[PDB]
């Protein structure tokens, strides 16, 4: 009964406290620290999508087992997303981010030394389970330090690190394992898939190391009744910002903050309680006051992920076909296209970041979705490799804006006590959509050119039609 009023008061006071702390060196530091975490997810996604389907041809496998590994890893990412997103609302943002990154790093490290396909599959699956939790936790964790004045722009600036991780993975793949030799094969060669697997883990290890230095989210502390810890963290933020700005004498004035109020047997009971609470949050996401928002969010996210991850398998085959037609008269191609795509995304992320708080989230999302639909439709007309690459750059440049807007909107539409639960559920749905799109678009490879693009464009059109119905959030305190 009373809790809604108490939480509204908490949000209103928290916004004022953040305005007192201001924006400065602390948020700039946290920005890079969490950017490393996003980069790790980018690296893993690239490895699953482009390296491993290329390595499947050298590692010995039965024909029926060829596509198994990516499916398994994406399902692991789905499970990890739901698990860590749910737990981050009960144990904390920093805690769960540390745990998930540790899992990812440990099993990525272990996968370098295995001597068989089964054990490699196991270790890679658990690495996926680990990394699946990063994005939902990262975005909420960063959002909880941002004042409403420029929260959208600051959240939008965060998405570059994912593309940077993709570029990092592609460059390391080209440098270390050209031709994608993957024999289960090193003897300390420094030019081997084991060394590539190790090098891909560096962003996650650095993320863990840097993240150990950062404080836990004070909003999480306040929502769980820990007044003094939240006060200490907020004082740390204020003092860091003011000392960096050359005003060490300024005093943090906040006096009091609103707050909300055998060994194995004990562990079992604890786990049961945690499961019950996570399930309660997940079911609350479909309560009468959030059901419609959740369903519309599901539709939009599913359609966007479906179209993108279907194109991830459509485009390389189109390039191969065009190259074959031209020749009728490698890793470097992937690295080159990835680098150009990142350079194309960059202007789109700059523009969307600068406009996010100027024109609102809904208009950004709708315009970017329409432009994404049309740019996807244009792919059917490419007659040559250069034109195809240019059109892919166009599509990425326009779609990054819609993904940014939907990230901000997803952050702001859900309350802090279940934000990471909602975000994790949506991210798990996105990875399920990735699985489905990859399989369905793989089924088209032998048939025709146009139907996959028409299908993706229709999916994006439906996504935009749903996106038009979401409520605007610009100019509101973080619920």
Question: Which 41-70 residues touch ligand X3U, going by CB under 6 A?
Answer: 42, 45-46, 49-50
| Contacts with ligand X3U, 154-183, as mask; x by CB under 6 A | -----x--x---x-----------------
> Judged by CB under 6 A, does residue 407 bind ligand X3U?
yes
The pair of three-digit structure tokens given for residue 92, joined into one six-digit string: 């904390």
Q: How far is the CB of 73 from ligand X3U (least distance, A)?
A: 13
Cα–Cα distances (Å) from 43 to 36, 167, 200, 214, 363, in that order, read 10, 8, 7, 23, 31
Contact letters for ligand X3U, residues 187-226 (x by CB under 6 A): ----------------------------------------
Residue closer to ligand X3U (CB basis): 29 or 312: 312
CB nearer to ligand X3U: give 171 or 257.
171
Q: Does 308 bind ligand X3U (CB under 6 A)?
A: yes
Task: Provide, rounded to whole angstroms, the least separation between the CB of residue 174 and ligand X3U.
Answer: 11
Q: In angstroms, what is the minimal distance from the CB of 100 to ligand X3U?
A: 15
CA dihedral 305→310→315→320, nearest 10 degrees, is 150
How far does CA 475 lie from the centroid of its chain? 25
Q: Which is nearer to ligand X3U, 270 or 292 (CB)?
A: 292
Instruction: Return the number of the residue (21 or 311) whose C-beta is nearest ligand X3U.
Output: 311
The minimum distance between CB 158 and ligand X3U, in angstroms, equals 7
Number of shown-chain residues binding ligand X3U (CB under 6 A): 29
Q: Which of 10, 17, 131, 426 binds ligand X3U (CB under 6 A)?
A: 426
CB closer to ligand X3U out of 155 and 278: 155
Of residues 314-343, which lie at the interface with ligand X3U (CB under 6 A)?
A: 315-316, 319, 334, 337-338, 341
Contacts 24+ apart (CB under 8 A), 467-471: 467/296, 467/300, 467/362, 467/365, 467/366, 467/369, 467/402, 467/406, 468/362, 468/366, 469/296, 470/293, 470/296, 470/297, 470/300, 470/362, 470/365, 470/409, 470/413, 471/293, 471/362, 471/413
With respect to ligand X3U, which residue has the nearer C-beta, 285 or 430?
430
CB of 337 to ligand X3U, least distance (A): 3
- As a 3-state breakdown, the chain gives helix, strand, coil percent values, each rounded to 5, of 75, 0, 25
With b meaning 16 or more CB within 10 Å and e meaning fewer, what string describes 231-241?
bebbebbbbbb
| Terminal Cα-to-Cα distance of the chain (whole angstroms) | 17
Contacts 24+ apart (CB under 8 A), 94-97: 94/141, 94/211, 94/214, 94/215, 94/216, 94/217, 95/216, 96/133, 96/137, 96/420, 97/37, 97/133, 97/134, 97/137, 97/138, 97/141, 97/211
Q: Which stretch binds ligand X3U (CB under 6 A): 29-37, 104-112, 211-219, 307-315?
A: 307-315
Q: Which lies closer to ligand X3U via its Cβ, residue 137 or residue 234? A: 137
The yes or no reply on residue 301 touching ligand X3U (CB under 6 A) is yes
How distant, in Å, are the alpha carbons of 142, 146, 239, 368, 384 from that of 230?
15, 15, 14, 38, 58
Alpha helical stretches, state H, 47-146: 52-55, 68-87, 93-111, 117-131, 134-143
Which CB, 53 or 218, lies closer to ligand X3U? 53
For ligand X3U, which residue has the nearest CB? Answer: 341
Residues 6+ apart with CB under 8 A from 153: 353, 354, 356, 357
- Note whether 312 binds ligand X3U by CB under 6 A: yes
Query: From the CB of 131, what's the least distance to ligand X3U, in Å?
Result: 12
Nearer to ligand X3U, 50 or 142 (CB): 50
Nearer to ligand X3U, 171 or 260 (CB): 171
Instruction: Looking at residues 373 to 402 of the shown chain, list those that interact with ligand X3U (rule: CB under 6 A).
Output: 396, 399-400
- Give the list of residues 6+ apart from residue 130 with CB closer than 8 angstroms, or none: 80, 100, 101, 102, 103, 104, 105, 106, 107
Give the shortest CB-252-to-ligand X3U separation in angstroms: 33
User: Which residue in 146, 430, 432, 466 binds ligand X3U (CB under 6 A)?
Assistant: 430
Closest distance of CB 215 from ligand X3U, Å: 23
Instruction: Give ∠ CA 370-406-90 in degrees, rounded to 5.
Output: 160
Residues that bind ligand X3U (CB under 6 A): 38, 42, 45-46, 49-50, 135, 159, 162, 166, 301, 308, 311-312, 315-316, 319, 334, 337-338, 341, 396, 399-400, 403, 407, 426-427, 430
């Amino acid at each position: 009964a009373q809790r809604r009023k108490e939480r509204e008061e908490l949000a209103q006071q928290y916004e004022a406290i953040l305005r007192e702390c201001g924006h400065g060196r602390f948020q700039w530091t946290l920005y890079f620290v969490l950017g490393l975490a996003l980069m790790a997810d980018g690296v893993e996604v690239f490895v699953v999508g482009f390296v491993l389907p290329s390595a499947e041809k050298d590692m010995c496998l039965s024909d029926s087992n060829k596509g198994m590994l990516g499916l398994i890893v994406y399902l692991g990412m789905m499970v990890g997303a739901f698990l860590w997103g749910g737990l981050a609302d009960r144990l904390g943002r920093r805690q769960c981010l540390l745990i998930s990154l540790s899992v990812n790093s440990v099993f990525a490290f272990f996968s370098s030394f295995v001597q068989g396909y089964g054990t490699f599959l196991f270790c890679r699956l658990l690495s996926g389970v680990g990394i699946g939790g990063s994005i939902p936790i990262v975005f909420s964790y960063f959002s909880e330090f941002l004042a409403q004045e420029k929260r959208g722009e600051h959240l939008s600036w965060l998405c570059m690190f994912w593309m940077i991780g993709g570029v990092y993975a592609a460059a390391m793949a080209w440098a270390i394992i050209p031709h994608y030799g993957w024999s289960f094969g090193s003897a300390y060669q420094f030019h081997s898939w084991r060394v590539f697997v190790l090098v891909c883990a560096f962003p996650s290890v650095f993320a863990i190391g840097a993240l150990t230095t950062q404080p836990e989210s004070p909003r999480f502390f306040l929502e769980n009744g820990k007044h003094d810890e939240a006060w200490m963290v907020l004082k740390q933020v204020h003092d860091t910002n003011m000392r960096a700005k050359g005003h060490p004498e300024r005093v943090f004035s906040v006096t009091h903050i609103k707050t909300i109020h055998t060994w194995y047997q004990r562990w079992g009971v604890r786990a049961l309680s945690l499961g019950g609470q996570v399930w309660g949050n997940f079911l609350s996401c479909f309560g009468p006051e959030y059901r419609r928002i959740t369903l519309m969010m599901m539709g939009v996210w599913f359609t966007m992920s479906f179209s993108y991850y279907g194109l991830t398998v459509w485009f390389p085959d189109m390039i191969r076909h065009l190259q074959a037609v031209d020749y009728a008269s490698g890793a470097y191609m992937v690295y080159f296209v990835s680098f150009l795509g990142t350079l194309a995304v960059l202007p789109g992320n700059i523009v969307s970041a600068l406009l996010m708080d100027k024109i609102g989230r809904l208009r950004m999302l709708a315009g970017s979705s329409v432009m994404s639909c049309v740019s996807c439709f244009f792919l059917s007309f490419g007659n040559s490799e250069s034109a195809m690459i240019a059109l892919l750059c166009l599509f990425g440049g326009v779609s990054i804006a819609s993904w940014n807007a939907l990230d901000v909107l997803t952050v702001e539409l859900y309350p802090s006590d279940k934000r990471t639960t909602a975000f994790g559920f949506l991210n798990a749905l996105c990875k399920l959509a990735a699985v489905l799109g990859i399989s369905i678009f793989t089924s088209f490879v032998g048939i025709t050119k146009a139907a996959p693009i028409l299908f993706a464009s229709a999916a994006l059109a439906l996504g935009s039609s749903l996106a038009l119905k979401l409520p605007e959030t610009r100019g509101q305190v973080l619920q």
